[PDB]
Each structure stands twice: as structure tokens, then as C-alpha cells.
């Protein structure tokens, strides 16, 4: 359907990452999926170039391609990791959950 | 409290006194090493409410994954949604 | 191929919009086409969400979608046209060209 | 010059008597108005390089596209690569 964040969770033992990821098990990353439909909706924080591309590709499909949905705002969670042996705690891990998506 | 998602968690914003307050709706979270009786602390602290990772909504230190092989399985990881909750920790693996 | 920046001429007159801006006749806008696959390569500045997503795509195309190739970086043109009948230069209109393209 | 892709063009980095300085291989333009005998200057300065307009390559400064619709089609819009080349216009429509 409409562009929007949908539900993903992230397992780190099953993507094979607690080798180095002591905490959490895992988390809430979301994706983005739908389709970006012109007009671009205000809530999608279309860029100029969104809308121009989005509206070539309606005149001609082949000239242009669609408005990807992606994450345009990302956000931090909280991390345990090991650097060659040393625990390392982040509570703000940058760019791991999506808390907006959009038309770019 | 709940309404204003503010949460008193250990501590090995200020850290006074061994303890530090976890804001929006942050949750208290424990790290220790154990190795048959050996039992270690090491880190605790508030533990970011975003991403809602699920063993956090455990009102007890629960510690409900089995842990990561790293360093022959000793970490022992929790957090939890109650006030100092992180004090101590409690084993519930799967193995 | 792979997700690279593409060329995409805008014509201002052709898409409707010269009824209100009087310069440029058009400009090269380019697009990003192209697949991201895993590994997500340094130039494409991959964020931490989009690397672990991609890897999620990889063991289960059904539950998350690969990195979308899009526009990392925009640039801004020169421009003149009209408000309510008043002439309005930018000699930077934002958001308008793609001078990077990334997978997110 | 063209290795420091500077350009220096009319004006209806500072703007001083009548001329102003358009780095980054930008291109000088001239917006006029123009309905029979009567033609205005509306605007000159500086055009950027990002999005390479087309037109704007030509060493002078010719209005080559048919002018929008906008005012009884009157506005006369140039850019070129040359210095000064800003100063006046020609035409060449394909109407």
C-alpha cells in the first residue's frame, strides 16, 4: 500500500552478530515499505527532487523511476559490544531504528 | 513514574550515590561475567527505551537469552522496567 | 547494475511548470538506479539500519526489503520564477539535483 | 579564468559597479522583459553550474527557448561563458 513504517525485528544471534553484540538480543529496527505515489504527501517530507522525479516518471515510466520509501529519520538504541576484548557500552548507538519514513 | 517515563536504576543527568535516573522511558539494565561461583559486575546504567528490546519489559533482572558464546558464555545481560530493578539478576535460559 | 548515479534531464516546459518558473528551460537532475547488495559498499554510505536490513533481505527475502538506492546528497540550482506575480531569484534553490547517490 | 572556473559578469564576493564575480564555473545571465519596442532589464548576475543548464553554454548570451507563457510571453531569459556576455541579448526562437 501507502508508503509507511512497518514492523522488523532484529534477532543478533540469528543474523550471526553476537559474536560481537554482547546486548540487547535484539530490537525494534522497522522498515519502510509501500509505494510513493505522486503527490508526494506532506507526512513523507518529499525533497524538490522527489517530486520532480515521481512526476517524470508518471508522464513517462521508462525516462524516470518511482520515489524509493525509505527511512528519513533514524534513531538510536543502546548497545553492548566487544572491541578486541573490551566491553563497550553506548547508550546512543547511531542510524539502527526507523521512527520516520519517506519519499526520496 | 510512568506518567512522565522516568525510571531509578543502579549505577556502578548525575550517577550520585550508585544510582542514576533513566528518562524517557529509559529502563534499567545490568551487565555481569559469571563463571560457576565467580560473579562479577560489570557495567550497569539506563538502557534506551528505543527500539523496545523485548527482555526489557521484564519487571525483574531476568536474564531470559542464553548468552553469547563470547568469552566461554559468561555474560549475563538484563534489563527491566521496575525502580533499582537492576540491582541483582536472575538466570532463566532456554539451554 | 549497481547503484549508481544515472542521468535524468528535467524539462520545465514539457512538465508543466514553466507556467511559473521563467528560468532554467531545464537541468540535468539525474536519478539513482541501480541494485545495493550486501556487502554495502563505502562509497554508497550505507547507515547501520540499511546494512542490517539488506543482511535480513539476504537470509529471508520475505521479511525486509533490500537497501533502496536514492539520492544521499542533493544540490541546489539556480532559479527564477514567479510569486503572485513577482519575480523571485535563488541563486541556490535547494533539494534540486543528486551530486550523491547511497542505498538506505 | 577556466582552470579557477571564475567568470565575471553584469549586475543590474561584492556586486561593485555594475559587475559581479560568479566562482565555481558558474555562468552570467539577464532576465529582460520585452513587448514590441519596449525591453527592460530585470535581472542579472550569477547562474550556477550544478544542474548544467543547456543553453547556458553558449559564449553569448541568446534566448533559444520559447519564453514561457507568463506575461503575454515577454520575459527573455540568457545565460553564457564568456565574460560580460551578460550585458545584452539575442534572439533565436523557434517560433
Redesign the interface.
Given at each position: 500500500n501507502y508508503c509507511k513504517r512497518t514492523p522488523?525485528y532484529?534477532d543478533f544471534?540469528?543474523?550471526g552478530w553476537?559474536?560481537?553484540?554482547?546486548?540487547?538480543?535484539?530490537?525494534?529496527?522497522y522498515?519502510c515499505?509501500g509505494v510513493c505515489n505522486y503527490p508526494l504527501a506532506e507526512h513523507l517530507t518529499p525533497?524538490?527532487?522527489?517530486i520532480?522525479?515521481a512526476?517524470?516518471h508518471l508522464?513517462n515510466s521508462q525516462?524516470?523511476?518511482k520515489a524509493?520509501?525509505?527511512?528519513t529519520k533514524?534513531?538510536?538504541?543502546?548497545i553492548?559490544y566487544?572491541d578486541k576484548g573490551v566491553?563497550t557500552?553506548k547508550?546512543?548507538?547511531?542510524?539502527?531504528?526507523?521512527?520516520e519514513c519517506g519519499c526520496? | 513514574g510512568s506518567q512522565n517515563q522516568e525510571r531509578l536504576c543502579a549505577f556502578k543527568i548525575s550517577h550520585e550515590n550508585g544510582t542514576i535516573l533513566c528518562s524517557k522511558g529509559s529502563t534499567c539494565y545490568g551487565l555481569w561475567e559469571k563463571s560457576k561461583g565467580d560473579i562479577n559486575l560489570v557495567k550497569q546504567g539506563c538502557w534506551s527505551h528505543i527500539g523496545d528490546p523485548q527482555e526489557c519489559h521484564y519487571e525483574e533482572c531476568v536474564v531470559t537469552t542464553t548468552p553469547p558464546s563470547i568469552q566461554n558464555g559468561t555474560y549475563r545481560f538484563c534489563c527491566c522496567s521496575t525502580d533499582l530493578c537492576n540491582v541483582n539478576f536472575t538466570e532463566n535460559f532456554p539451554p
Open positions: 522488523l532484529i544471534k540469528e543474523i553476537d559474536s560481537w553484540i554482547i546486548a540487547p538480543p535484539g530490537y525494534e529496527a522498515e515499505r525533497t524538490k527532487h522527489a520532480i522525479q512526476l517524470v508522464k525516462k524516470a523511476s524509493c520509501c525509505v527511512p533514524l534513531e538510536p538504541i543502546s553492548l566487544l566491553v557500552y547508550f546512543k548507538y547511531e542510524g539502527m531504528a526507523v521512527s526520496r | -
